[PDB]
Design a protein around this ligand. Structure first.
Ligand SMILES: [Mg+2]
Ligand SMILES: [Mg+2]
Ligand SMILES: [Mg+2]
Ligand SMILES: [Mg+2]
Ligand SMILES: [Mg+2]
Ligand SMILES: [Mg+2]
Ligand SMILES: [Mg+2]
Ligand SMILES: [Mg+2]
Ligand SMILES: [Mg+2]
Ligand SMILES: [Mg+2]
Ligand SMILES: [Mg+2]
Ligand SMILES: [Mg+2]
Ligand SMILES: [Mg+2]
Ligand SMILES: [Mg+2]
Ligand SMILES: [Mg+2]
Ligand SMILES: [Mg+2]
Ligand SMILES: [Mg+2]
Ligand SMILES: [Mg+2]
Ligand SMILES: [Mg+2]
Ligand SMILES: [Mg+2]
Ligand SMILES: [Mg+2]
Ligand SMILES: [Mg+2]
Ligand SMILES: [Mg+2]
Ligand SMILES: [Mg+2]
Ligand SMILES: [Mg+2]
Ligand SMILES: [Mg+2]
Ligand SMILES: [Mg+2]
Lengths: 110, 288, 97, 85, 87, 75, 245, 95
RNA sequence: GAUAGAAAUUUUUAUCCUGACGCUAUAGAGAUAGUACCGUAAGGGAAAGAUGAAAGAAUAAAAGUAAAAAAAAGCAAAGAUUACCCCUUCUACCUUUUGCAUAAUGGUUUAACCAGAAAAAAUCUAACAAAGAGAACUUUAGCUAGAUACCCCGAAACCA
């Protein structure tokens, strides 16, 4: 895969924002996709169970869990349900937060 | 990094001796033995089912079968011969130029869209190429040369506004194949055949400057194209004055599959050598 | 249910003999080796079964279509018959229909 | 087990060995090649490609010979290439 | 123990016996020859001029191509009768 | 002479002495030296039958070499 | 120094470079190892997966048993349906019967062959290596030039370095292995000597110590790292590609 | 249904499903309403409307139909001009 | 209807490198053999070996019995007891049925044999992800892989 062309202007027309020159000090990190996209996806089970998966996370995910659920709680009035997989390096959350989590990981610049 | 690492200093060797697959990976099979799952083994009692013969799937027990009461209809009728065109949104296109998969600099036809893995064509399945849609219409900032098999008005518009040139070109099943996975066609080691002309019904679509059809009269190109701007309300750029002009101008023969090559040729990729016929009948054949 | 009276000589097996030490050696050959040869070619076996898998019906119908005309008369016969039986049984029987 | 060679080829390698090996080569050659006998009983369609009337597309079309048995007496006279159907 | 020699795919041109009875007929075809040129073809010692159609093949391809695929001008004229008849 | 009998075996035919020519001989003429069409089937089977016995003779002897070499660690 | 870019948030690893000529030359040097190969998150899950996939996918079991169709004879009802006053049977080759057929059992040559997907096997070698390193039992070497063809030297070397019982020695190619290595090791059970084209998970776990040559590591690091950055193949990779061999 | 073919080993499809139905990509199966060409004069205009319709098949029928139908009719399709392409996706479905 | 089912057009690298998550005397070939034996015939068709270097050295565990015949009462046991019974308390077991102690079926007993196979869709675990698959395909979170599934015996007939 081509390393994507450095531009003068960010974000780009299609909305692509590069991760920063430094990385934050938060005790966890998110590898961008092999496409340099933020590894947040949506997935369903049994057709009715809606889920949101954060991927490729290196560090204490527990912290990431804290921060994510604390970001989402004002939105739903209540903590959203969470499943942490420590060996997978993966986070899972009930409902579709795809759009908002995309933004929230553009915030911290992962 | 992964503090898990430092937990492995503590523990005994990882070897074959100690291995557990991920819990819930193997959902264990059961076997009709024992008090629970033996004795009729979940096959029920007597009747048909216990003997394993219950009738075929569409069957209602002789009442006229659901799927068979309903009258036939033209539906999937001639489904094999109905042309398909794989869609390409403008949003996806902007995307692909943005991450520099397909670069706008050199010309863009299907092949390039393919190699960036931005689109997938299965010609055997009656796919006659990529077609264009307007999804990122407002999003679209890129100046590009695009050649597709079909496009929609709004799409043509959104490329014009930015100053690129869109051409509607056709490919037959065979030539289209050659187009999409070209390297394996070369390794086939057969000459590079003539391009077909589009079928009769399709003819009017490709003869219109309306679509900027590759077989259309260039005399109407500047006309209908400028028309596009008055309808959609923008100032039409002067392409002839641009630096990238000579690439945007670049066309194919209606007989040419690729850029820079010609019917009749043969590629030897071992010797990195092109081969052209010096025989006359051949040249009359492939150049016609 | 009468069971063996005398202990057998304990079979001693070196797991360090050649074949076991060298197990699975070239497995990654395509990957590590800039793929030219596929893991398939590490499969030494019956002509029709190399780098392939299937249930009984598929196996059989395969052996037929590949080596069929090189088979003996009788085996061949039994093969066509096994085929028929299987046709009938997979299609036409089951609980699950 | 299997045979080293398929049995359809047993009648040919039957010929490669033994006395057939000293046979005149021209003979064996006129024997090898089987030209397809003239259509007599079945009537052929001309083209390789023929349009489907129902479906409306060009269709690859091939011609299958019809089996014709010859009683032994057929070989005694001249039947002009035909026989029993 | 030292391991076996790694299995290698021989990169040389490879030609079966044309006269061996057991050898498959799919490896004895013209196309296989063409393919073999494509692979190496310098070293494969394939006659280059053979990678193009014969005079027979040529005139037949010609015959069928002019048969089922008319002229652009001719197709436009095929369409004018239709459009005007429907008008 | 080498001849081929009705059973599809190829046999060595020991000759005999007769006071008269063979085409004038009853008993000789009603002997058939040749194979008929159907016999061709059995011929194959014979081969096959025979072909197995060799096949599994070999496979036995090979076995007898493993056993010995694991019973007697020479060298 | 590593021949390949590390991701910005991740520092490389370093391993002693040991050499093989003296017993007593332990750390002859220092090597930076790539974090994305030798520091990867350890997953025994995939170790397991691929370890099995190694075991099985080669497996063809030839075990045939004969169905009531394939047994010798008994093409007939042994006695009549009615009046005998014993249990009714078809052929004496009914599976019920003594010398008769086998109901289900094994069938024929039977293969288990399946392809673990690409990037999986890849990440498996990755993990295996990471683990051999993190459990401290990986030893990088330069050279591999051996002082002599006496195998006792080698065994005693492993003895002086507390290398544990078994060892897998990895070299770059089949042709380039020096003659003393080949000599001394080919007469050894526990030690093994292999081109890095045949590095494999099963063997990695089968030997209590892994030993890697420097050209070998520079090679591996690359060949594996290729795969997080790679497209989905269009056609087989053995074919011509723009960048690719 | 033929769950395993003879020559290919594959799973065959019923054709008489296909001639009278249509599968969207959502999984909704579409059909004619029976008897619509049948005894028209005898029928009220209302009925005639109700018949000339295209209608949807309940879950049972759909699943059934899928079983008699291979992968190839379940694939995604972009036809030029397609009257039904407008329809293939599900919108606003909250379950 | 049940089902049947193509081709054009594409793909395929050498030999070398043999074995065995095959059986172990009811298994494994029918086979110690097409032998005995059974059929007028075509045809059917068995069962069985075991000490040790040397015979140019003479475990006591299946049913069944014996050592030891039985003592008012009754699904045979159980609760028990100082004590075997004596006391008290419980309608064999399977299949099959609305319902069986049933006087409905099956079985002398022991041993060895003797019957649930499939991956469309689905879930579960995982890789990578607007993509994924070691070619061909599928995609509006998806593709890919893995793991999860559908028995045994029997007619009268029928055709050659
Ligand atoms: Mg999903
Ligand atoms: Mg039960
Ligand atoms: Mg029952
Ligand atoms: Mg009932
Ligand atoms: Mg498609
Ligand atoms: Mg099976
Ligand atoms: Mg029989
Ligand atoms: Mg019979
Ligand atoms: Mg019967
Ligand atoms: Mg027996
Ligand atoms: Mg047996
Ligand atoms: Mg062998
Ligand atoms: Mg036996
Ligand atoms: Mg006893
Ligand atoms: Mg009592
Ligand atoms: Mg009662
Ligand atoms: Mg009753
Ligand atoms: Mg009742
Ligand atoms: Mg009663
Ligand atoms: Mg009674
Ligand atoms: Mg009764
Ligand atoms: Mg009773
Ligand atoms: Mg009864
Ligand atoms: Mg009963
Ligand atoms: Mg009784
Ligand atoms: Mg599936
Ligand atoms: Mg099962």
């Amino acid at each position: 895969i081509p390393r994507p062309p450095k531009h003068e202007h960010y974000p780009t027309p299609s909305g692509w924002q590069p991760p920063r020159d430094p990385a934050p000090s938060l005790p966890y990190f998110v590898r961008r996709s092999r496409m340099h996209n933020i590894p947040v996806y949506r997935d369903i089970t049994h057709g009715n169970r809606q889920m949101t998966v954060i991927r490729k996370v290196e560090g204490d995910i527990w912290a990431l869990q804290k921060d994510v659920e604390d970001f989402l709680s004002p939105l739903l009035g209540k903590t959203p349900v969470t499943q942490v997989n420590e060996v997978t390096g993966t986070l899972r959350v009930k409902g579709y937060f795809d759009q908002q989590l995309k933004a929230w990981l553009l915030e911290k610049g992962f | 990094g992964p503090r898990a690492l430092d937990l492995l200093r503590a523990l005994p060797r990882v070897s074959l001796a100690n291995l557990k697959p991920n819990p819930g990976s193997r959902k264990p099979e059961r076997r009709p033995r024992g008090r629970r799952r033996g004795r009729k083994c979940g096959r029920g009692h007597k009747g048909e089912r216990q003997r394993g013969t219950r009738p075929r799937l569409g069957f209602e027990g002789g009442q006229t079968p659901f799927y068979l009461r309903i009258p036939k209809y033209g539906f999937n009728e001639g489904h094999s011969f109905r042309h398909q065109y794989q869609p390409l949104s403008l949003n996806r296109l902007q995307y692909l130029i943005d991450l520099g998969r397909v670069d706008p600099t050199q010309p863009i036809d299907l092949t390039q869209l393919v190699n960036g893995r931005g689109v997938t064509i299965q010609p055997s399945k009656r796919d006659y190429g990529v077609q264009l849609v307007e999804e990122g219409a407002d999003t679209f900032k890129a100046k590009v040369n695009i050649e597709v098999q079909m496009a929609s008005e709004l799409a043509i518009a959104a490329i014009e506004k930015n100053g690129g040139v869109v051409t509607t070109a056709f490919y037959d099943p065979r030539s289209l194949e050659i187009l999409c996975k070209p390297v394996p066609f070369f390794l086939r080691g057969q000459p590079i055949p003539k391009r077909m002309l589009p079928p009769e019904a399709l003819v009017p679509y490709y003869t219109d400057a309306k679509n900027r059809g590759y077989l259309a009269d260039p005399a109407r190109f500047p006309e209908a194209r400028l028309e596009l701007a008055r309808k959609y309300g923008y100032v039409l750029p002067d392409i002839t004055k641009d630096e990238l002009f000579k690439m945007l101008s670049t066309r194919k023969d209606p007989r040419q599959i690729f850029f820079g090559l010609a019917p009749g040729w043969v590629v030897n990729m071992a010797d990195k050598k092109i081969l052209k016929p010096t025989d006359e009948n051949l040249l009359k054949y492939y150049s016609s | 249910f009468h069971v063996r009276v005398t202990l057998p000589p304990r079979k001693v097996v070196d797991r360090w003999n050649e074949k076991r030490a060298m197990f699975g050696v070239y497995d990654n050959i395509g990957i590590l080796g800039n793929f030219e040869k596929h893991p398939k070619e590490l499969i030494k076996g019956p002509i029709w079964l190399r780098g392939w898998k299937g249930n009984e019906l598929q196996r059989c119908i395969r052996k037929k279509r590949m080596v069929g005309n090189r088979m003996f008369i009788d085996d061949l016969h039994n093969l066509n018959k096994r085929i028929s039986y299987l046709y009938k049984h997979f299609n036409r029987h089951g609980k699950y229909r | 087990p299997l045979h080293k060679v398929p049995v359809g080829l047993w009648k040919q390698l039957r010929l490669w060995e033994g006395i057939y090996s000293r046979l005149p080569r021209h003979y064996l050659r006129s024997l090898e090649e089987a030209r397809t006998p003239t259509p007599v009983h079945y009537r052929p369609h001309g083209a390789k490609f023929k349009i489907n009337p129902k479906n409306w597309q060009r269709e690859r079309v091939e011609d299958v010979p019809i089996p014709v048995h010859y009683p032994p007496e057929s070989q005694l006279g001249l039947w002009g290439g035909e026989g029993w159907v | 123990y030292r391991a076996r020699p790694p299995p290698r795919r021989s990169q040389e041109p490879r030609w079966p016996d044309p006269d061996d009875p057991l050898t498959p007929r799919w490896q004895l075809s013209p196309r296989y020859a063409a393919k073999q040129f494509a692979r190496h073809g310098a070293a494969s010692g394939v006659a280059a001029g053979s990678l193009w159609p014969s005079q027979e093949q040529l005139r037949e391809l010609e015959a069928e191509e002019r048969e089922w695929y008319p002229s652009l001008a001719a197709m436009q004229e095929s369409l004018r009768v239709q459009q005007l008849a429907e008008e | 002479a080498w001849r081929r009998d009705i059973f599809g075996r190829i046999i060595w035919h020991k000759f005999k002495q007769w006071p008269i020519p063979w085409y004038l001989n009853k008993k000789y003429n009603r002997k058939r030296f040749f194979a008929m069409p159907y016999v061709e089937r059995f011929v194959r089977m014979r081969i096959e039958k025979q072909a197995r016995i060799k096949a599994r003779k070999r496979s036995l002897e090979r076995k007898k070499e493993k056993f010995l070499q694991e019973k007697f660690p020479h060298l | 120094k590593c021949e390949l870019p590390v991701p910005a948030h991740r520092r490389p690893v370093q391993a002693w470079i040991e050499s093989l000529r003296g017993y007593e030359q332990e750390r002859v040097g220092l090597t930076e190892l790539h974090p994305d190969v030798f520091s990867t998150a350890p997953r025994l899950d995939i170790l397991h997966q691929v370890a099995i996939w190694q075991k099985n996918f080669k497996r063809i079991s030839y075990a045939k048993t004969k169905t009531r169709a394939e047994v010798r004879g008994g093409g007939r009802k042994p006695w009549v349906q009615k009046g005998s006053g014993r249990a009714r049977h078809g052929s004496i080759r009914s599976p019920i019967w003594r010398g008769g057929g086998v109901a289900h059992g094994p069938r024929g040559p039977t293969s288990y062959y399946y392809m673990l997907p690409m990037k999986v096997r890849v990440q498996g070698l990755k993990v295996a290596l990471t683990v051999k390193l993190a459990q401290d039992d990986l030893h990088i070497v330069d050279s591999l030039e051996l002082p002599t063809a006496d195998p006792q030297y080698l065994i005693e070397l492993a003895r002086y370095r507390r290398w544990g019982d078994s060892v897998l020695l990895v070299d770059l190619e089949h042709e380039d292995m020096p003659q003393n290595v080949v000599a001394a090791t080919s007469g050894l059970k526990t030690f093994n000597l292999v081109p890095a084209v045949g590095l494999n998970v099963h063997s990695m776990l089968k030997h209590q110590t892994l030993v890697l040559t420097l050209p070998t590591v520079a090679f591996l690091e690359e060949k594996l790292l290729w795969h997080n950055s790679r497209y989905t193949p269009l056609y087989p990779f053995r074919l011509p590609y723009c960048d690719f061999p | 249904v033929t769950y395993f073919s003879s020559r290919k080993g594959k799973r065959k499809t019923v054709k008489a499903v296909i001639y009278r139905f249509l599968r969207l990509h959502s999984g909704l199966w579409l059909r004619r309403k029976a008897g619509y060409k049948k005894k028209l004069w005898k029928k009220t205009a209302a009925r005639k409307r109700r018949l000339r319709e295209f209608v949807f098949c309940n879950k049972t029928q759909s699943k059934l139909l899928d079983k008699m139908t291979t992968s190839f009719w379940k694939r995604r399709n972009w036809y030029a001009d397609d009257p039904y392409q407008k329809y293939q996706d599900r919108t606003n479905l909250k379950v």
